């Protein structure tokens, strides 16, 4: 059916979402970056350490109710 | 170690030249490499996390072959999260992976503006730190050893056994950076030879060839 979750950023800020399952999480990812104003190529949406790609759904991922999606930014290095 | 680069140079130049960014090229392991990502391998640009994690997963894919050690590679966000937030923040990143069933654990380490590699070798019972800039970070391996102790418990309920578990760093025993941007290249090329159980043979003079070779290797998802 549907489940709620929180997308906690590195600054501890929460953005609540509900989603169906077997639907791509691409839209949830797009909505989060539309708010932070930053490009999505800047942000990585990882759940329990697993990279969420646009084809991933909460069904194939372990995600249950009240779960949390950690948000990390791009790492460059030289 | 050798290998030529054939008509690949045309293919490498094809994606190096400008196109719309964010256009995905090469998809495997549920990961994408945009045109912006591959641009970090051009010239002397700083490698990003998408290129490194994609390469580590390719080494992970090669580890399943006979005659090679089995490898599990953490993503580049693991060590930073574990050191700053503790084990319980990363305790659930390995709920589908038994880290004690593999031979080698690859831990790519991001240091703000610098890349480095820590390796756990259950065969040698070693936790080695590799820095192409010569830096010593024995605290990083002490962090990883404490992680293994808290990971054998919570996942297997066994006190991890710590004999001969050598925690050390490399000095002038591995090739050094010699510039200020080839760091991610050294980190990935270190792991390539380590996962092949081959001595580290390259120098800084091989990095321009390595950058273009990795472009083709990532596009075709085939390690050479």
From Swiss-Prot, chain A:
Positions of the Ubiquitin-like domain: 1-78
Subcellular location, record wording: Cytoplasm; Nucleus; Nucleus, PML body
Organism encoding this protein: Homo sapiens (Human)
GO cellular component: cytoplasm; kinetochore; nucleoplasm; nucleus; PML body
Expression across tissues: Expressed predominantly in liver.
GO biological process terms, semicolon-separated: negative regulation of DNA binding; protein sumoylation; regulation of protein localization to nucleus
Complexes and interactors: Covalently attached to a number of proteins. Interacts with BMAL1. Interacts with USP25 (via ts SIM domain); the interaction sumoylates USP25 and inhibits its ubiquitin hydrolyzing activity. Interacts with SAE2 and UBE2I.
Family per similarity comment: Belongs to the ubiquitin family. SUMO subfamily.
Effect of residue 20 to A: Impaired interaction with USP25
Record's protein name: Small ubiquitin-related modifier 3
Effect of substituting residue 19 to A: Impaired interaction with USP25
Keywords from the UniProt entry: Cytoplasm, Isopeptide bond, Nucleus, Ubl conjugation, Ubl conjugation pathway
Gene behind the chain: SUMO3
Interval of the full protein contained in this chain: 15 to 92 of 103
Keyword Heme: no
Job description of the protein: Ubiquitin-like protein which can be covalently attached to target lysines either as a monomer or as a lysine-linked polymer. Does not seem to be involved in protein degradation and may function as an antagonist of ubiquitin in the degradation process. Plays a role in a number of cellular processes such as nuclear transport, DNA replication and repair, mitosis and signal transduction. Covalent attachment to its substrates requires prior activation by the E1 complex SAE1-SAE2 and linkage to the E2 enzyme UBE2I, and can be promoted by an E3 ligase such as PIAS1-4, RANBP2 or CBX4.
A GO term for molecular function: protein tag activity
Extent of the signal sequence: none
Covalent cross-link (Glycyl lysine isopeptide (Gly-Lys) (interchain with K-? in acceptor proteins)), residues: 78
Post-translational modification: Cleavage of precursor form by SENP1, SENP2 or SENP5 is necessary for function.
Curated annotation (Swiss-Prot), chain B:
Name of this protein: Sentrin-specific protease 1
Catalytic residue list: 114, 131, 183 (nucleophile)
Effect annotated for changing residue 93 to A: Impairs SUMO2 processing and SUMO2 deconjugating activities
Tissue: Highly expressed in testis. Expressed at lower levels in thymus, pancreas, spleen, liver, ovary and small intestine.
Ranges for region Protease: 31-193
Effect recorded for residue 92 to A: Impairs SUMO2 processing activity. No effect on SUMO2 deconjugating activity
Impact after mutating residue 183 to A/S: Abolishes SUMO2 processing and SUMO2 deconjugating activities
Residue pairs linked by disulfide bridges in the UniProt entry: none
Motif (Nuclear export signal): 215-224
Quaternary structure, from the entry: Interacts with RBM33; promoting ALKBH5 desumoylation and subsequent activation.
Motif (Nuclear localization signal): 155-158, 208-214
Family named by the database record: Belongs to the peptidase C48 family.
Residues of the full protein shown: 421 to 644 of 644
Reported effect, residue 115 to A: Abolishes SUMO2 processing and SUMO2 deconjugating activities
Subcellular location: Nucleus; Cytoplasm
Outcome reported for the amino acid change (mutating residue 22 to A): No effect on SUMO2 processing and SUMO2 deconjugating activities
Outcome when changing residue 110 to A: Impairs SUMO2 processing activity. No effect on SUMO2 deconjugating activity
Entry function: Protease that catalyzes two essential functions in the SUMO pathway. The first is the hydrolysis of an alpha-linked peptide bond at the C-terminal end of the small ubiquitin-like modifier (SUMO) propeptides, SUMO1, SUMO2 and SUMO3 leading to the mature form of the proteins. The second is the deconjugation of SUMO1, SUMO2 and SUMO3 from targeted proteins, by cleaving an epsilon-linked peptide bond between the C-terminal glycine of the mature SUMO and the lysine epsilon-amino group of the target protein. Deconjugates SUMO1 from HIPK2.
């Amino acid at each position: 059916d549907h489940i709620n979750l929180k997308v906690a950023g590195q600054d501890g800020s929460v953005v609540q979402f509900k989603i169906k399952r077997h639907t791509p999480l691409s839209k949830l990812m797009k909505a989060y970056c539309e708010r932070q104003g930053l490009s999505m190529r800047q942000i990585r949406f990882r759940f329990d350490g697993q990279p969420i790609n646009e084809t991933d759904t909460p069904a194939q991922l372990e995600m249950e109710d009240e779960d949390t999606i950690d948000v990390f930014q791009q790492q460059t290095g030289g | 170690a050798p290998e030529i680069t054939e008509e690949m140079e045309k293919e490498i130049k094809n994606v190096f030249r400008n196109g719309n960014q964010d256009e995905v090229l090469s998809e495997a392991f549920r990961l994408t490499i945009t045109r912006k990502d591959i641009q970090t391998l051009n010239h002397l640009n700083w490698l990003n996390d998408e290129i490194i994690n994609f390469y580590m997963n390719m080494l992970m894919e090669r580890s399943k072959e006979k005659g090679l050690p089995s490898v599990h590679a953490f993503n580049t966000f693991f060590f930073t999260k574990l050191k700053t937030a503790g084990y319980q923040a990363v305790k659930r990143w390995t709920k589908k992976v038994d880290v004690f069933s593999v031979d080698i654990l690859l831990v790519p380490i991001h240091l703000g503006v610098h890349w480095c590699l820590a390796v756990v070798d259950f065969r040698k019972k070693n936790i080695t730190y590799y820095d192409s800039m010569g830096g010593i970070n024995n605290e990083a391996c002490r962090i990883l050893l404490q992680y293994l102790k808290q990971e054998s418990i919570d996942k297997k309920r066994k006190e991890f056994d710590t004999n001969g578990w050598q925690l050390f760093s490399k000095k002038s025993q591995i090739p050094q950076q010699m510039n200020g941007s080839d760091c991610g290249m050294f980190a990935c090329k270190y792991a390539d030879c380590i996962t092949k159980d081959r001595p580290i043979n390259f120098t800084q003079q091989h990095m321009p060839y390595f950058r273009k070779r990795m472009v083709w290797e990532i596009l075709h998802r085939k390690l050479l």
